[PDB]
Specification:
Oligomer: monomer
Number of domains: 1
Strand order of the largest sheet: 1-4
Distance between the termini: 11 Å
PDB class: hydrolase
Strand content: 5-15%
Largest sheet: 2 strands, antiparallel
InterPro entries: Glyco_hydro_134
Pfam families: Glyco_hydro_134 (PF21087)
Number of strands: 4
Keywords: Complex, hydrolase
Number of helices: 5
Order of helices and strands: EHHEEHHHE
Keywords: Signal
Bound molecules: a molecule of 6 linked components (BMA-BMA-BMA-BMA-BMA-BMA)
Helix content: 40-55%
Amino acid sequence: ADRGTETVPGLGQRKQQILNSGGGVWDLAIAMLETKNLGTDYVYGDGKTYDSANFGIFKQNWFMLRTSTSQFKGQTTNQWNNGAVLNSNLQQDIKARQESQNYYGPDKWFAGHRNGESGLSNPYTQDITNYKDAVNWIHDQLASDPKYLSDDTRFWVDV
Ligand SMILES: OC[C@H]1O[C@@H](O[C@H]2[C@H](O)[C@H](O)[C@H](O[C@H]3[C@H](O)[C@H](O)[C@H](O[C@H]4[C@H](O)[C@H](O)[C@H](O[C@H]5[C@H](O)[C@H](O)[C@H](O[C@H]6[C@H](O)[C@H](O)[C@H](O)O[C@@H]6CO)O[C@@H]5CO)O[C@@H]4CO)O[C@@H]3CO)O[C@@H]2CO)[C@@H](O)[C@@H](O)[C@@H]1O
């Protein structure tokens, strides 16, 4: 099976931090696909650098951060280490992602989040659509019972 459930100690505390730090159920769904622990403690930049570098609980990339958020408006590729603040500031992390999606719109945001600058030029590939559909499924699972907003259940999808 390409999707399912698992129980992760501490997840509910993370879900409630997200929902109490400006996040909605939609942000939770994206974050839940990004990491198992709703955390930022994957390797720095997810092992990537400059525009590809991933930061925050959604693993937003620096290209998206510098082009579409008020926190990083107008910054350069070389300034990519400036995104690291999102690894410790959840409020700004969520606000950045929400702003990013409002700048690009959901379609474009999905493409540029999933595939960087290249995704903006081809936003409806099968891979981006699959990622979109997985996030939608996870959101549907979380929305199906309020207990999933505070328990330790993770809904995962293999994209
Ligand atoms: O413009 C700059 C250049 O950008 C390039 O594009 C980049 C882009 O900049 C950015 O770096 C982007 O980064 C992606 C990244 O590639 C990746 O997709 C990432 O998404 C992850 C996350 O890292 C984890 O890998 C996560 O893993 C979860 C699994 O999906 C799954 O849910 C799993 O569940 C399992 C379960 O736990 C249990 O074990 C069960 O038994 O089995 C299940 C199945 O495994 O749990 C995992 C979590 O632990 O998946 C997500 C999603 O895939 O997110 C970012 C996107 O934000 O990459 C692109 C490059 O592709 C280019 O455009 C370049 O041209 C530019 O110059």
